[PDB]
C-alpha cells in the first residue's frame, strides 16, 4: 500500500540524517594502506597478534550489525523514511567490514588471514556478546512485533554501534595516535565517523517509541538495559583483559570502554553509568 513519499515529512530527522548518511559515503579504494607496512613490520609480535584480533571482532560485528541488525530493526518500521535511513546504515556496515579485508590483505599473508578468521570464529567470547545483542534482532523474525521488542532491539543496536566496538577501536586509534598504522587508522576514523551517527539516529528512534509505550512497558524495558548494559560490560572485562594484557593496556581500554558505554546511554536519552573519566590521550590524538 504506502510508497515512500519525501515530500511530507514523516519524522523532523530522517532527511537530515539521510543527507549526511549519504554525504559521508566511502569505500576501502580511497585510502591506499600499502605505506603501513613499514611500521607494521616494528611492532612486536605481541602487539600485532592483538591488532589482528581485535580487527576480527570489529569485522564480526559489522558482520551481524549489516545483515541482522539494520535489516530486522528496519523491516518492522512503519515510518519509510527512517527506514530508508537504516537501510542505507546496513549497506555502511558492510562497506565497514570489507574495509578490514582490505586492511588484512597487505598487512597479513593467505595463511595468516585463516587464522584471524579462525580464531574469531572460534572465540567463545565473542559468539556470547553477538550472540546476545542478536538475540534481541531475531526476535524480530515474526509477522508482527511489539514496540517494546522493537524499543530493545534497538536499544540493542546502539549498545553495539556506540559502546562494544570501542573495546576494538581503541588500539587503532592508539596506534595511530603515535604515527603507527595511521592509513588503517584513517580507516577506522571514516568508520568511527558513520557510527557515531549510526547510534545517534538509531536511540532517536528508540527515544520515539520510549514516548508511546505504557508506564509499566517504560520501567521493564529500563530494567532490561541496566541488565543488559550489565551483561555486555562483564564480558567486555573478560574481553578486554584476554586481548590487552599482553600489552599492558587493559585499564586504558577499560577506561574508554565506559566512557563510550555512557556514549551510549546518552543517545538512548539515559543518565551515564560509570563515573566521568579522562580518555588516553594517544587515543584523542588519534581521533
Ligand atoms: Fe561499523
Redesign the pocket.
Known sequence: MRAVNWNKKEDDFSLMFWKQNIAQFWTEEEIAVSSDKNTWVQLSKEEQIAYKRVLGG?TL??TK??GEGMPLVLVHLENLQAKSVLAFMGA??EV??KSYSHIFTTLATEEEIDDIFDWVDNHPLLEKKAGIITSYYRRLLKPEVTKKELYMAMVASVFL?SYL?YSGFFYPLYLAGQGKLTASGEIINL?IR??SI?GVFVGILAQQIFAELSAEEQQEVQKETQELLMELYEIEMAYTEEIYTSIGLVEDVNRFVRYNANKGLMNLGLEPKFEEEEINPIVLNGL
Open positions: 570489529l560485528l559489522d550489525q549489516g555502511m556496515e565497514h567490514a554501534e566496538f568508520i558513520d557510527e549510526h
